[PDB]
Symmetry: C3
Subunit: 127 residues, 3 copies
């Protein structure tokens, strides 16, 4: 294997896991929740604001390991309700509208800290 | 990175995502739901008929990018109920009975368009 | 592609899937549930005991294909309740506290055999 990503620009991986793991030209990013990296608190407001935070956390992790949003190949969005699909996609498009990685969008029963949105991703670069 | 897959033989990726993304010898396919690629409507009938459509969509995407079902290494089945396990496996075996990729089968709270079955996959070819 | 993993030290993959699939230097492990590989029965007791069984099954599969826990890059934990987070992490740390792979921890509606914990993983080795 090769290296782990630790950045203060995304929430600290408190437990037995890392924000991301880089092996060769591939990065595996941990599921990001709407937590502010500096205050450690949950963003409380609209689903667009929560999705913005999640994608900002994801972006910071990619960039901390030498990756970018253009390197992302597969994304998985977890939510507590499909009612958020349209609005989540609206914010999502502002990050991946040009790039367009593969994706699955599913609604689970419950997320960490009782959040409503969580997004993980796999990225690959070079060629 | 390398290339994206767009085919009329699987449902059109409407939003900010692609049906699949091919990077090197790897393909990351988006979660497929029981939608007919030509009419755009949800298959309404038995769970075998819905699983058939999902796997046909998956197969079309693989084949549109130069991949096949034999290249599939990991699959993830999402459902709304585990009651469908036996019957989903029955149809699934007709596509991957010989090949036998790694798999996770989980039941979530809700899926896009309120469907009951969704299947994503990762494929790798060559050697 | 390259090879499949079959070991009596993890529960037998009964249906149309394999315990894991090794392609090149990568392994894709199937979601493991708290089943005893020898008796085929569900571990019934505390969530720590169930997590131990799941991680023991995962470990056996990795080791049967020439991989180890240090090779694991991405893990996905599925549960029926987030109430188990702290205790699952406690047992999880005893397997991946040093290594620290990327991770997502989500709570779904239902799991196979009505279990409360299921863990899948991707591993990569060499360099």
């Amino acid at each position: 294997m090769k290296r782990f990503v630790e950045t203060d620009k995304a929430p600290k991986a408190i437990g037995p896991y890392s924000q991301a793991v880089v092996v060769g030209n591939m990065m595996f990013v941990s599921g990001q929740i709407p937590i502010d990296p500096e205050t450690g608190e949950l963003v409380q407001g609209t689903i667009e604001e929560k999705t913005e935070r999640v994608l900002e956390n994801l972006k910071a992790i990619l960039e901390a390991g030498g990756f970018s949003l253009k390197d992302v190949v597969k994304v998985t969005v977890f939510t507590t309700s499909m009612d958020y699909f349209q609005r989540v996609n609206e914010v999502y498009s502002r990050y991946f509208g040009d790039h367009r990685p593969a994706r699955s969008f599913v609604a689970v029963a419950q997320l960490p800290r009782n959040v409503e949105i969580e997004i993980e991703a796999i990225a690959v670069k070079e060629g």
